[PDB]
Amino acid sequence: MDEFEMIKRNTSEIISEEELREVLKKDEKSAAIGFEPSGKIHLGHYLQIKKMIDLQNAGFDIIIILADLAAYLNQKGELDEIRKIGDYNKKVFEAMGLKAKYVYGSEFALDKDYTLNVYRLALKTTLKRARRSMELIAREDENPKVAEVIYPIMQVNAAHYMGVDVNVGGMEQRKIHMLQRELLPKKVVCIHNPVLTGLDGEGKMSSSKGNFIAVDDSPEEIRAKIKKAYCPAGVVEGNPIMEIAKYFLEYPLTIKRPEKFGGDLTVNSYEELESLFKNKELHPMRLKNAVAEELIKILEPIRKRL
Amino acid sequence: DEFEMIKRNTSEIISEEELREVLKKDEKSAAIGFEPSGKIHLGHYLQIKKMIDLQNAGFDIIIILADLAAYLNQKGELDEIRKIGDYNKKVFEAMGLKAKYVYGSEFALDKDYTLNVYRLALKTTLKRARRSMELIANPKVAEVIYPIMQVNAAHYMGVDVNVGGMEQRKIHMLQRELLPKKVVCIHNPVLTGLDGEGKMSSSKGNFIAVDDSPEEIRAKIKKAYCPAGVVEGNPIMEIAKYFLEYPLTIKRPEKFGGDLTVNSYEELESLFKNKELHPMRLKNAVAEELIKILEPIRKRL
Ligand SMILES: N[C@@H](Cc1ccc(O)c(OCc2ccccc2[N+](=O)[O-])c1)C(=O)O
Ligand SMILES: [Ca+2]
Ligand SMILES: [Cl-]
């Protein structure tokens, strides 16, 4: 359970913890995650790669899908441009400390046997359910394309084709994963990570919303981005600064300050920080300052490698 | 970070800025005094862990084994106390501490040492000496000799850092007043005994010894003071705070929410204060974690 603790920690749900126990009893086990290549890799990506590294340390072989064909179907551009971004993304994930098997979706998702099962699955997936599964994933389209409903079926089939025991993704993948659990002969365990709040507090962090910290942002950019961030005094949920403190910072954490309010604060844990903030013993401005400097240092090794 | 490793789980540092200055030097030392004890318990272990923190931050560690004080306080003959102290040395080594050891009797009766005690006695008012002892103490002459003896011992050691309990606070402040070299003082908390009636001591069933068997640990924790919802003065919660590693998992039935993974002591504290974690499940968890923490020590002894 030191391993299992490593896995469950900071996830939103595991479907199911029962089945996940049975998986852990094996000398060979594999876990996969896919990412549409993105020109900006931000903290939401980093959270998920941290979880893949967790799974690695519990004895899992890790597969990262650079999902060039998914990004193509989801209107991100032409394959050759997308693949270039994918190669950059691979370098960022490696810089994050993940040594894994990096594979382009198009290396397997065009195989005759893959496609034939996409077509089998299409006969069993309603249009309603396919479109519903994409509400949090599909690029906004006034006039939605056929591509949008092929995408979730292709994703269902990826775990079947590769024979992985565990699929990891953000909570926005939840509906595809439930479809996958109903349709495939072997259940695969699904681990869902939280979705970070955008820096302005409006909805989720996204490469296309301009409301994110990128792992390669400069110190000066990170300070500017945190200083303008939404950070309501004493409110924790939907507060992206507190989310950063929860999911990325290392404790103990020293928050310097003059003796005239409370003096220097050595914070033992995120929970201590949460108490201090909810009781308004720590002001948003001082929280932001400390979080900016700590995140700059956490991200420095990734920056240095790119 | 080195400062944070030294501060964690201390009661006070006199002073933090001075500590940060010491941390810049490439050669630095810290001392602590222990009266030799036939059983080494978690109260001792708390203080040795703090010397290990210092050792890991580059300090050379000196342990003063206080055999003269023990001899004067009626704990036996000096040769008998030496045998206990030599055992304590093996326990501290098993705990991970690499230190130099000195017995009080090896320096504190030397002629030039004694003359300096008397020099300090001539300089030091009874009023100031009594004030330094107000907390530790028909008062005896011994009461005012103790503080000037402690000051002289700090002068004789010449360490950068002194470590002890808040009980020693006023002695440490007198050392800082009277001596040219300003020693940095680190004060550690004390542990409640398993009975909840005072500080951990060698009273029957009132301590966990670091070499207690797993069954002895389970039996003592089972009958310890641990009232529902109470964190203050709760020795089981203090053990979770000062010795356990986080995160940790508490098995709990699904109708309560299922197994608990607690990220930190503070998360444990809120849960227990709220009666969201029952004393018997806290006790069972703390006992099993503590057994695992102590096992490498037990096996080296
Ligand atoms: N939906 C994910 C992307 C993702 C997740 C899991 C996968 O197995 C995955 O790749 C397979 C795939 C799924 C859907 C369409 C195309 C492909 N493809 O690249 O061949 C992509 C995202 O939102 O970035
Ligand atoms: Ca025994
Ligand atoms: Cl002594």
Q: Which CATH number belongs to the domain containing residue B281 in this structure?
A: 1.10.240.10
A61 shares its domain with A179: yes
Give the gap in angstroms from C-alpha B159 to the nearest C-alpha of chain A.
Answer: 26
Per-residue buried b or exposed e for B80-117, using 16+ beta carbons within 10 Å of the residue's own CB: ebbebbeebbebbebbebebebbbbbebbeeeeeeebb
Are the beta carbons of A60 and A14 closer than 8 angstroms?
A: no
Q: How far is the CA of A19 from the centre of ligand 1 (A)?
A: 23
User: Looking at ligand 1, which residue's alpha carbon is closest to its atom 20?
Assistant: A105
Distances (CA, A) of A10 to A140, A170, A288, B118, B233: 30, 12, 22, 62, 31
CA B168 to CA A47: how far, in whole Å? Answer: 47
Output DSSP code: residue B41.
Answer: B
Closest CA to A251 of B82, B138, B124, B247: B247
Q: Are residues A164 and A221 in the same domain?
A: no
Structure tokens at A269: 């844990």
Bridge-based pairing state of the strands B184-188 and B12-14:
antiparallel
Residue B90: its H or E element: helix B78-94
Residues A199, A295: contact at Cβ < 8 Å? Answer: no
> Is B68 in contact with B105 (CB distance < 8 Å)?
yes
Given A157, A173, A196, which residue is the final one in a domain? A196
Identity of the amino acid at A14 = I
- 3-class SS of residue B249: strand
> If you count them, how many residues does chain B have?
301
Q: Say if residue A214 is in the same domain as residue A178.
A: no
B121 and B247 share one domain: no
Rounded distance between C-alpha atoms, residue A33 and residue A189, angstroms: 12
| Nearest CA-CA partner of A52 in A2, A100, A122 | A100
Chain B residues near residue A269 by CB distance under 8 angstroms: 246, 263-267
Give the residues after which the backbone of chain A is interrupted, taking a C-to-next-N distance over 2.5 angstroms as a break. none
Question: For residue A69, how far is its CA from the centre of ligand 1 (angstroms)?
Answer: 7
Q: A7: distance to nearest CA of chain B, Å?
A: 11
Q: Which residue has the tokens 């909810």?
A: A278
The Cα–Cα gap between A169 and B279 comes to: 37
CB contact under 8 A, B270 and A271: yes
Q: Look at chain B and report how many structural domains it folds into.
A: 2
Residue keyed to tokens 């519990």: A58
Angle at A243 between CA A242 and CA A245, to 5 degrees: 60
Length of chain A: 306
φ, ψ of residue A62 to 5 degrees: the values are -105, 130
Return the HEC string of B147-172.
HHHHHHHHHHHCCCEEEEEHHHHHHH
- Report residue B211 as tokens: 């070499």
End-to-end alpha carbon distance in chain B: 32
φ, ψ of residue A233 in degrees (nearest 5):
-55, 130
In this structure, what token pair is assigned to residue B165?
């309990």
**B184 and B264 both lie in a single domain:** no
Place of tokens 């004694």: B114
Do A153 and A238 reside in the same domain of the chain?
no
Which of A78, A104, A73 lies closest to A89, judged by CA? A104
To the nearest 10°, report the CA torsion of A199, A204, A206, A211: -20
* Method used to determine the 3D structure: X-ray
Sign of CA dihedral B232, B235, B237, B242: positive
Instruction: Tell me which H or E stretch contains B250.
Output: strand B248-250
Distance between CA A87 and CA A125 in Å, rounded? 33
Q: Is the CB of residue A151 below 6 angstroms from any atom belonging to ligand 1?
A: yes
Structure tokens at B127: 């009023």
Q: Which amino acid is located at B117 in the chain?
A: V
Burial of A287 (0-12, 13-18, 19+ CB in 10 A): buried
Residue A68 alpha carbon, nearest atom of ligand 1: 19
Pair of tokens at residue B278: 């029952």
Burial of B125 (0-12, 13-18, 19+ CB in 10 A): exposed
Please identify, by atom number, the ligand 1 atom nearest to the C-alpha of residue A110.
20
Q: Which helix (H) or strand (E) holds B131?
A: helix B126-133
B170 and B216 assigned to the same domain:
no
What are the phi and psi torsion angles at A278 (to 5°)? -65, -35
Tell me how far apart the alpha carbons of residues B290 and B217 are, in angstroms, rounded to a whole number: 8
B210: three-class secondary structure by DSSP: coil
Which of A266, A278, A281 should we substitute to test contact with B (largest number of B Cβ atoms within 10 Å)?
A266
Task: Quote the CA–CA distance of B89 and B101 in Å, as a whole number.
Answer: 8
For chain B, give me the number of helices (H) and strands (E)?
A: 13, 8
The reply to whether residue B4 touches residue A264, judged by beta carbons under 8 angstroms, is no
Domain closes at, from A170, A196, A222: A196
If asked whether residues B20 and B98 sit together in one domain, one would say: yes
What Cα–Cα distance (Å) separates residue B187 from each residue in B210, B226, B238, B256?
22, 26, 17, 40
Longest CA span, chain A? 71
Can you tell me which atom of ligand 1 is nearest the CA of A72? Answer: 16
The sign one gets for the Cα dihedral B81, B85, B88, B90 is: negative
Please name the amino acid found at residue A233: A
First to last CA, chain A: 35
Which CATH number does the domain housing residue A120 bear?
Answer: 3.40.50.620
Give the three-state DSSP class for B89: helix
- Whether A272 sits inside 8 A of B249 (CB atoms) is no
Rg of chain B taking only CA atoms, in angstroms: 21
Contact (Cβ atoms closer than 8 angstroms) between residue A263 and residue A298: no
Comparing CB atoms, the residue among A1, A252, A270 nearest residue B8 is: A252
Helix A240-247 with A284-305: angle, nearest 10 deg: 50
Query: Percent helix, strand and coil across chain B, each rounded to 5?
Result: 50, 15, 35
C-alpha A206 to ligand 2 mean position (Å):
59
Sign of the CA dihedral B237, B241, B244, B245? positive
- CA A65 – ligand 2 centroid, Å: 56
- Nearest-CA distance A252 → chain B (Å): 7
Set of chain A residues whose Cβ sits within 8 Å of the Cβ of B271:
none
Domain boundary at B170, B191, B212, which? B191
The Cα B287–Cα B297 span in angstroms is 16
Q: Which tokens is A232 given?
A: 């309501």
Tokens of A19: 């089945």
Residues B204, B181 share a domain: no
C-alpha dihedral sign at A79, A82, A88, A90? negative
**A89 CB less than 6 Å from ligand 1?**
no
* Same domain? B197 vs B187: no
Distance between CA atoms of B202 and B43, rounded to whole angstroms?
A: 10
Q: How far is CA B262 from CA A37, B239, B249, in A?
A: 35, 15, 6
A14 and A60 both lie in a single domain: yes
Q: What is the number of the ligand 1 atom nearest to the C-alpha of A32?
A: 8
* Residue A227 contacts residue A271 (beta carbons within 8 Å): no
Minimal Cα–Cα distance from A60 to chain B, Å?
21
Q: Which of B156, B184, B180 is CA-nearest to residue B172?
A: B184
Contact assessment for residue B134 and residue B102, using Cβ atoms and an 8 Å cutoff? no
State the nearest Cα–Cα gap between B9 and chain A, in angstroms: 9
B102: closest CA among B117, B82, B72, B87? B82
Residue B136: how many other CB atoms lie within 10 Å = 13
| B67 C-alpha to ligand 2 centroid (Å) | 25
Phi/psi region, residue B247 (left: phi>0; alpha: psi -120 to 50; beta: rest), is beta
Nearest to B263 among A1, A266, A270 (CB): A270
Could you tell me if B114 and B236 lie in one domain? no
Closest partner CB to B266 (pick from A9, A266, A275): A275
Ligand 1 proximity of A294 Cβ (cutoff 6 Å)? no
Question: B226 lies in which domain range?
Answer: 192-301
| Phi-psi region at B158: left, alpha or beta (left = phi > 0; alpha = psi -120 to 50) | left
User: Residue B300: enclosing H or E segment and its boundaries?
Assistant: helix B279-300
- Cβ-based neighbour number of residue A151 at 10 Å: 25
**DSSP-based three-state secondary structure for B101:** strand
Does the CB atom of residue A154 touch ligand 1 within 6 A? yes
Does the CB atom of residue A155 touch ligand 1 within 6 A? yes
Euclidean distance between CA atoms A241 and A289, whole angstroms: 10
By C-alpha distance, the chain B residue nearest A263 is B16
Please give the distance, rounded to the nearest whole angstrom, from the Cα atom of residue A33 to the centre of ligand 1.
8
How many CB atoms within 10 Å of residue A285?
11
Helix/strand/coil (H/E/C) assignment for every residue in chain A: CHHHHHHHCCCCEEECHHHHHHHHCCCCCEEEEEECCCCCCEHHHHHHHHHHHHHHHCCCEEEEEECHHHHHHCCCCCHHHHHHHHHHHHHHHHHCCCCCEEEEHHHCCCCHHHHHHHHHHHCCCCHHHHHHHCCCCCCCCCCCCCHHHHHHHHHHHHHHHHCCCEEEEEHHHHHHHHHHHHHCCCCCEEEEECCCECCCCCCECCCCCCCCCECCCCHHHHHHHHHCCCCCCCCCCCCHHHHHHHHCCCCCEEECCCCCCCCCEEECCHHHHHHHHHCCCCCHHHHHHHHHHHHHHHHHHHHHHC
Whole-number Å distance between alpha carbons of B283 and B225: 10
